[PDB]
Design a protein around this ligand. Sequence first.
Ligand SMILES: Cc1cc2nc3c(=O)[nH]c(=O)nc-3n(C[C@H](O)[C@H](O)[C@H](O)COP(=O)(O)O)c2cc1C
Ligand code: SF4
Ligand code: SF4
Ligand code: SF4
Ligand code: SF4
Ligand code: FES
Ligand code: FES
Ligand SMILES: [Zn+2]
Lengths: 436, 188, 108, 232, 220
Amino acid sequence: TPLTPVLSRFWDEPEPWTLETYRRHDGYQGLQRALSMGPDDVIAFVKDSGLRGRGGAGFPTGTKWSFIPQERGDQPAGGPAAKPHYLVINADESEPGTCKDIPLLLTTPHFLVEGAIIAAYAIRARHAFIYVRGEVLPVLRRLQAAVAEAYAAGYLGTDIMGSGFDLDLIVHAGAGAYICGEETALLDSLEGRRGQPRLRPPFPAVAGLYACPTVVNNVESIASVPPIMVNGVDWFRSMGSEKSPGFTLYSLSGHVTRPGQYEAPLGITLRELLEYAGGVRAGHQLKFWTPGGSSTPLLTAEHLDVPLDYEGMASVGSMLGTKALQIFDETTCVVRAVRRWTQFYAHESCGKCTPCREGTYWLAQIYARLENGAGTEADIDKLLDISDNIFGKSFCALGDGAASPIMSSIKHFRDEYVAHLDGGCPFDPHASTLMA
Amino acid sequence: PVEMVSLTIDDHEISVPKGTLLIRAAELMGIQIPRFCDHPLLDPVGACRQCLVEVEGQRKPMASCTTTVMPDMVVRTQFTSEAADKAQRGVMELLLINHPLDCPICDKGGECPLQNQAMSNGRPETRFEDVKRTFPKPISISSQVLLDRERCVLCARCTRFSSQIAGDPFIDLMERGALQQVGIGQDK
Amino acid sequence: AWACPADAIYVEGADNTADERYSPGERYGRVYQINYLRCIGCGLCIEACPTRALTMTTEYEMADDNRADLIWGKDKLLAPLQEGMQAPPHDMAPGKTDDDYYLGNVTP
Amino acid sequence: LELGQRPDEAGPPISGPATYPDDVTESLRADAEQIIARYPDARSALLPLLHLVQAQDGYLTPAGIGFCAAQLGLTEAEVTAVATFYSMYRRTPTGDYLVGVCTNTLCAIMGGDAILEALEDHLGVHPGQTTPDGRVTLEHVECNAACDYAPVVMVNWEFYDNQTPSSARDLVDGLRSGSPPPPTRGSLCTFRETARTLAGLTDPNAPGGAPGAATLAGLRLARERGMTAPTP
Amino acid sequence: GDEPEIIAVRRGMFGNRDTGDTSGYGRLVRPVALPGSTPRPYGGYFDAVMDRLAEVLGEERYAMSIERVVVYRDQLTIEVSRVQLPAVASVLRDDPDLRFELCLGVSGVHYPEDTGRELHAVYPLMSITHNRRIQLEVAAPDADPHIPSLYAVYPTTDWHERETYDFFGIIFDGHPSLTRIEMPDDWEGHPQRKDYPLGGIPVEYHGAQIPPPDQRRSYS
Ligand SMILES: Cc1cc2nc3c(=O)[nH]c(=O)nc-3n(C[C@H](O)[C@H](O)[C@H](O)COP(=O)(O)O)c2cc1C
Ligand code: SF4
Ligand code: SF4
Ligand code: SF4
Ligand code: SF4
Ligand code: FES
Ligand code: FES
Ligand SMILES: [Zn+2]
């Protein structure tokens, strides 16, 4: 399948982030089309679009919007008024490997701004929030400038284009916490609390921000909305599979020549993406890779030609995740990479769980002993059992994400794990440093 | 009229008021599900993950302390489900790895829910040959209460009480990850 | 004392404050009495002790004309101070901690 | 008494000045009112407020915790619980430039570990510590969503892409000695200014932010091979 | 009855009779039930012994006499109905196929929470001829602690009926002389009843004393 620049389309232009450039390419025409439609009509339009969550869950965004309980023509009484609806855009992008949201926001933030306005109109949310991680300050500045431009241009505030719709968009600069990227932890951090996941039910659709109905969407999911409001539904369905239609950003990174963001239809196999990138780092082969971020199970060359869509990744046993596509070649030690990911998870666990907290602590220590040569034959069986005790038992999916690299790496490279038992890591780290 | 829902725990049927938590139903039926963060008088939090049980139709084990009964639910605890027992024992193990070897000197010794539930639902010997987390102990959070953070299982019962029951949230879960620890602000 | 079937041991703990430390760790046995008119020599106490602090020597001669004199306190039960030992009220061995004492890595 | 955490504990507990001067509190109150004005719920402003105080000082202090608690009607305990949870709220005096080498798996094994070791040996400062000059604070950061831009290095959360140990050493030398090299994909400013920006009290219009090579790679390949969208 | 015999109801986790050292664990309710009737295919020779007992006793009499059959830990316990005890005892002793010539004694046990059946008497019977063992269990209420004395059938029950009367107050009516054997005849109360206090004294110590174990805490 070929590359399909849609969001990437405007880039390479001078100052593409400016509202002028965005308008120069049909910018905000989709918003006009939306406001010409009824909110429920917009929700149905997106549902027919088959757009699915780009934040890793893969959930259909249209149904997610439909779950918000608007007063669909029924007014049993004038009081108490229905709780306000909130649209939170998950501009947090902190999953390892995932670097698609940040370039998009930095280059064409008006895509996300228009999508957020359209979505808020769809769910009739009077207020919307862009929760963007604090470690991407350039993206924060770009997004704030874009929101200010939209306010000045009349796309935000009250009576958007005289449509009677009113929306106030707030850019919230979250502090450093990977877990905050998860629903109900995003909301908790928005509420000025510890970014820890909530107990579900109740779900954010009824008990979200400030205990009011809320929708949380990845910036990619929202940004894909304006492209489909124009060009119609059939255009979007023309890309990817029937169960996973549309285009998506793939963040080729790691031991691949010409790494970057490739906008391609869903289902493109890693083989095509590597071919476009020029293949793996010259003089080396593909050892392993993460389709999604570190949260998704590792994959090896055997799956090199599996379509990168939700169905295909599920068939292989992994998850499409955030299309992080982290690539690693022979020079890398799978034990080293998994140890670093486990350290990341231990650093990122909110601590609420016993499984995630304690098990990630233990796994980090075990992997440190493996890499240092203090490992033992029982350490591999431990790693496996501990991961089993973490996976599925933790409170949120971060525990499962922490377990996933360990389980997959063991399954694919028990040989390398055993080899580490001899005297520690045999691989020379300098071999993988891009000759830096 | 209160609505009675009915469900089978293990293989015994029971009727309980709608909205009842699985842990409460098991208590009424006489099944002892291990639990740390659950408290009948506190709003459930599902933190420790100790009360996991297998429920038909659910891929994951469900924290019985957060699961509301349903009119046809089928529940099998560690007494009648190898998966539930394995999950609970793994959680207990992960709970004990960082715990201090303080039972002889711990005040809670002999009356410690962790000791009793490790005996009833824990493995007999450790696999944790690694290094344990450590904190300075015991630090004083008030003139009356000493806090030994190493023994803390981060069940949040102290904090959840000081927030819900008494409106005095002067203690809260500080820090993040393995470093998370109940604490007062600075000196207040 | 917990394991004694005859309630022949009375023990009370106290904190090992830095100014006056008697044992490693944060607790020591401030008051320790054995009522040898209730002791049955079963040996469950020494089986119970998690520190080998309590042993049973082969010495047996014991008798008195007074009931009270056979309630042996900490002073009578403590082993004699041998060569290389210092007075109990002193800080732990340099560069050592409770775990070192229990693992046996302590020397005079 | 000696309540609370011991001062020497890991992840230094919030410490420092106990209270702000009257003028500082007045300016902070103005800024905090401005911040709180933009949220439906007052407590929702806690994270920005924590940034705001972290701009007044170089790091979170009991004075800042108390200010936020008073502003939002929370107890100092709740504010401390929120503050200690997030990594960007540094708990020690932070230099004018927070140099964070991304040492996550990808950026790490692709050079990041080498970059961090080189900076530790060059500055002498260990991760999390600050230079004696007080201008550079070395730290190691998790993935910063710049993976395609390998060995990324953040300077006050401004990107420096495709760094190398020599390049990173030159960057830190420039920061320490004065003239800072421009970020590859951002606009550099002092730590206090970035903290104020995170609170949303800084002008968003800033220079830099060009897409860069990696972000364009896909589009450039599409141009070369003429790949495009299917069109309506 | 047919359900297992609940002898005590313990509330709260950790086997704590009191309110609980830690809040929130006191809501568990677990009845302590001694095993109920065993399904008919009794193991070993128990099945044969019960078949013979039901053959010698009429179906009506067998139903009236045998309240329960419990095969626990490969041991057979016939919960015999009171009043009928002498008849079944005679049948067991005299019948050639049963022939339990050796009654080993009478043991009293008290179940203060077992309504209407607080007092139990256990008759361990052995047949040397067939090399078989069984137990008979006879329940009497605390308010009517009378039981038929087996003195005519098993003279050895004397000094066992007397001992169990002394320690529980079970009145084995028909016994030649049901006088106290262990306690002084002037003694008040029946020591082995659960309500009867242990009667210890505090153990003295320099500056302190340890109350008897019954007064102190326990987690049974
Ligand atoms: C630990 C964890 C971290 C996550 N981080 C992010 C994130 O940074 N950005 C994001 O868009 N989704 C993230 N998610 C997914 C969120 O749950 C997200 O709100 C949900 O998948 C909906 O995304 P959608 O808009 O693609 O449907 C994370 C999930 C977990 C479990
Ligand atoms: S799994 Fe980890 S991140 Fe998720 S709630 Fe539990 S401790 Fe927090
Ligand atoms: S809290 Fe820990 S040290 Fe204290 S008794 Fe319980 S298990 Fe032992
Ligand atoms: S200190 Fe608080 S969180 Fe820790 S175990 Fe006790 S009640 Fe639970
Ligand atoms: S030998 Fe020890 S345990 Fe046994 S009764 Fe005497 S003091 Fe108690
Ligand atoms: S008691 Fe239910 S998860 Fe902790
Ligand atoms: S690994 Fe460095 S930015 Fe992602
Ligand atoms: Zn290695």
